[PDB]
Amino acid sequence: KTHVQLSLPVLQVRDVLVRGFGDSVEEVLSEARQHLKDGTCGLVEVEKGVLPQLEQPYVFIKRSDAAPHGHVMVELVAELEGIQYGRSGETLGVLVPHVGEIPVAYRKVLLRK
Numbered sequence: 001k002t003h004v005q006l007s008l009p010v011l012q013v014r015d016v017l018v019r020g021f022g023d024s025v026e027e028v029l030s031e032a033r034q035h036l037k038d039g040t041c042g043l044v045e046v047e048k049g050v051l052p053q054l055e056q057p058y059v060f061i062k063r064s065d066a067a068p069h070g071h072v073m074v075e076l077v078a079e080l081e082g083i084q085y086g087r088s089g090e091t092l093g094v095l096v097p098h099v100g101e102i103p104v105a106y107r108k109v110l111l112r113k
């Protein structure tokens with residue numbers, strides 16, 4: 001399947017134990033996809049002061065279309081020192097590893113895999 005329905009746990013930035021996926025744009029996109037596939041991926045909603053508390057490169061989910069079965073269609077865009085690799089819509093949040101943090105909510109997405 002080109003798209004996979006996922007329910008992503010929404011985490012508070014201060015709860016996040018593992019604050020990024022790795023050390024290169026290509027590694028963070030790889031790791032983000034593996035965690036999304038393995039159900040070990042969380043989402044942090046981007047507000048004032050969030051991104052400086054997380055590790056670059058960042059992996060964003062961005063809205064890729066204007067929402068089957070409640071699931072917003074999204075794709076991955078990485079960012080490192082103000083340059084983005086990919087082009088998409090509005091940020092739904094920044095992905096991080098999930099290692100058992102308690103979420104505040106769930107974000108239903110259809111991920112272009």
Ligand SMILES: COC(=O)[C@H]1CCCC1=O
Nearest residue numbers: 004033034036037038113
């Ligand atoms: C069924 O596979 C999945 O869960 C997706 C996640 C991203 C890659 C993939 O195969």
